[PDB]
Every structure is written in C-alpha cells, then in structure tokens.
Amino acid sequence: DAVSLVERQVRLLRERNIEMRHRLSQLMDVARENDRLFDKTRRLVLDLLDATSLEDVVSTVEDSLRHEFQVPYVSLILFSDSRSVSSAEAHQAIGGLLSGKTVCGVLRPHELAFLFGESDRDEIGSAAVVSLSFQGLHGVLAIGSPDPQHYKSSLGTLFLGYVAEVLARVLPRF
Amino acid sequence: VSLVERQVRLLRERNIEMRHRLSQLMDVARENDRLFDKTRRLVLDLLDATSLEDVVSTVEDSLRHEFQVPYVSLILFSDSSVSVGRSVSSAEAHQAIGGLLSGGKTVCGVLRPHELAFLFGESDRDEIGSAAVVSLSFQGLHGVLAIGSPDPQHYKSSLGTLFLGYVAEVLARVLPRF
Numbered sequence: 001d002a003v004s005l006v007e008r009q010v011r012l013l014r015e016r017n018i019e020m021r022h023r024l025s026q027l028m029d030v031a032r033e034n035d036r037l038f039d040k041t042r043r044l045v046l047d048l049l050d051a052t053s054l055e056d057v058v059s060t061v062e063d064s065l066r067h068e069f070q071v072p073y074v075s076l077i078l079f080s081d082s083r084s085v086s087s088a089e090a091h092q093a094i095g096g097l098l099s100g101k102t103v104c105g106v107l108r109p110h111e112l113a114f115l116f117g118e119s120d121r122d123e124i125g126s127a128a129v130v131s132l133s134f135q136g137l138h139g140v141l142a143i144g145s146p147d148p149q150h151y152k153s154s155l156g157t158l159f160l161g162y163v164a165e166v167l168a169r170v171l172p173r174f
Numbered sequence: 175v176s177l178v179e180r181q182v183r184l185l186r187e188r189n190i191e192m193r194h195r196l197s198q199l200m201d202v203a204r205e206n207d208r209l210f211d212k213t214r215r216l217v218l219d220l221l222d223a224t225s226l227e228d229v230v231s232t233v234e235d236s237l238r239h240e241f242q243v244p245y246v247s248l249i250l251f252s253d254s255s256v257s258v259g260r261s262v263s264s265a266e267a268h269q270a271i272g273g274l275l276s277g278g279k280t281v282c283g284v285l286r287p288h289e290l291a292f293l294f295g296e297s298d299r300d301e302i303g304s305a306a307v308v309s310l311s312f313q314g315l316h317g318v319l320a321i322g323s324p325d326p327q328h329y330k331s332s333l334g335t336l337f338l339g340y341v342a343e344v345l346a347r348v349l350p351r352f
Contacts, residue, residue, distance in 0.1 A: 002175070006178045010181050013182065013185040013186065014185065016189060017189055024195065024196050030203070042340050046344075049344070049347050050347075165218055
C-alpha cells in the first residue's frame with residue numbers, strides 16, 4: 001500500500017514527462033519552421049527591393065514561392081494594357097474573386113482554370129489568391145496545392161498576404 | 175522502498191527542469207510572434223515613408239513603443255548636419271564607434287562607456303546591461319542603429335540578432351531615397 005502509492009507517483013511523473021517531451025518537440029518544430037518562413041520572407045523582401053527590372057521582380061517572386069516556400073502551383077499575373085493580361089480581360093475571366101482580402105480553399109473551376117491553367121486545375125485541391133493592389137490594381141498572385149487541407153485557412157495562407165503587401169508596393173516602380 | 179524513493183526524486187528534478195524549459199520556450203515563441211508582426215508593419219511603414227523625417231520618426235517610435243525596446247539610437251551621418259533627429263559627421267561617428275561601423279562585432283553586447291555615451295541619450299543609459307549595434311549601409315554608409323536593454327543576456331535574443339539586422343537592411347535601402 002505504502003509502496004503502491006509511491007509507485008503510482010512514479011507512473012504519474014513518467015506520464016507527465018513523456019507528455020512534456022511531446023510538447024517540447026512540437027514547439028521546437030514550429031520554432032524551426034517560423035525561423036525558415038522568416039528567413040525566406042526576408043530574402044524575398046530584400047531581393048524584391050533590389051530588383052532592377054519588372055522581369056527580375058517576376059522571376060524573384062516565382063523562384064521564391066516555388067523553391068523556398070515549396071508551393072506546388074504558383075501563378076503571378078500582372079495587369080497591363082500594353083504572363084500578363086488586360087485588367088478588363090482579368091475581370092471577364094475571374095471577376096467576382098478580387099475584393100484586398102485573401103480568398104482561399106476550393107475556388108471555382110473557371111477561376112482555377114484562369115489562374116493555374118486547364119491542366120493543373122484538376123490536381124489542385126486548395127488554393128489562396130490575392131489582389132496585388134497598392135494605389136492601383138497591378139495584378140493577381142495565387143498559390144495552390146493538391147492537398148485540400150493546405151491553404152484552407154488564413155493560418156496556412158498568411159505569408160501570401162505579406163508577400164502581396166510588399167510586391168504590390170514594388171510593382172509601381174516599373 | 176528506497177529504490178522507488180530514489181526514482182521519484184530524480185523524476186521530480188527532471189520534471190521541474192522540463193517544465194521551466196518548456197515554459198521559457200513558450201515565452202520565446204510568443205515574443206517572436208509579437209516581434210514578427212511589429213517588424214512586418216515597420217517594413218511596410220518604411221516603404222510607405224514620404225520623407226526623411228517620416229523615416230527616422232517611424233523607426234524610433236516603432237522600436238520604442240511597438241517593439242518596446244527601452245533604449246533606442248538612430249544616428250544618421252552628414253557633414254552638413256541639420257535635423258530634428260540625431261545627425262553627426264561620419265568622421266565624428268568613426269572616432270566614437272568606428273570599429274563597429276566597419277562591420278566589427280562587440281564581445282557579449284558590452285559597449286564601452288564612451289560608446290554608450292555616444293549612442294544613447296537616455297538619462298538612465300548607465301543601466302544598459304547589453305546592446306546590439308548595426309551600421310546602416312547599402313550602397314554607402316548612411317548611419318547607425320542601436321538598441322539596449324538592462325538585461326545583460328538580451329544581445330543574444332532574436333531581437334538583437336534577426337530582427338534588428340533585418341530592420342537595418344530595409345532602413346539602409348530606404349534612406350538613400352531622401
């Protein structure tokens with residue numbers, strides 16, 4: 001009885017210590033990931049600020065999103081009356097999507113077609129899109145993944161809005 | 175009964191040490207989230223700055239009241255020094271803290287009295303325990319940015335390392351425009 005009590009103290013302490021090892025490990029994982037997202041975002045921001053052409057801006061954003069952030073599907077479409085479409089062509093295709101806020105989850109078939117092309121549409125389960133606007137509408141930036149759980153919430157798609165904020169301020173310089 | 179007593183004693187120590195370790199890790203994660211957000215906002219505010227005054231004012235107000243740093247120094251270098259904020263000549267800067275301007279590192283966030291007195295105007299700068307200093311250079315040396323804390327271990331923090339350096343890089347790029 002006296003030993004059974006202290007034995008139970010040992011079981012309870014072990015359970016607690018195992019539980020805290022799980023939390024510690026889970027916290028160290030998210031810490032490491034935020035360090036990455038932070039570093040990749042920094043390099044993106046500085047590379048965008050140091051861009052000398054519109055082509056270098058586009059290349060920077062696509063290279064980073066695809067190969068630093070490991071986004072399966074990336075679409076950056078700039079609007080121009082001069083890839084890029086007319087603003088009027090953009091509203092004809094996907095008008096009803098743009099209206100500062102990030103839209104995510106299951107987009108409509110015809111919107112996935114315009115952003116990601118006919119082929120890729122079908123392998124995209126979730127997607128997040130944002131308008132590139134700062135003192136004018138400069139285009140649209142979209143990211144997509146086959147996992148429909150990825151890019152369903154604001155949490156998973158938060159970086160997209162941060163990039164769009166900076167990218168939208170950089171596009172007018174060209 | 176003494177094997178089981180010995181077991182409980184070591185399990186308790188281990189348990190206590192883990193709790194504290196996990197607690198600190200949670201505090202650090204929370205502070206880093208707060209700092210990520212303030213940095214994001216500062217970067218955009220800087221890109222949106224419409225003047226030199228707006229640039230320097232935004233940095234100092236943000237670092238002091240958003241980041242909540244107790245000691246803040248922003249000095250711009252200029253021969254013809256005319257400004258609301260602090261402005262000294264590059265020559266004068268280098269006489270006081272030139273080793274750090276040239277890209278040098280301090281030993282354990284410890285500045286020397288004359289360096290503290292050059293960087294920090296706060297009447298209680300004598301209470302600074304550690305500091306981080308970074309020069310503002312991008313296609314030229316534009317000035318110096320410095321933060322200080324009463325805590326001697328603060329120079330090792332994510333603020334002192336990551337965030338300050340990134341703020342400096344954006345600030346160094348934006349200053350040339352004015």
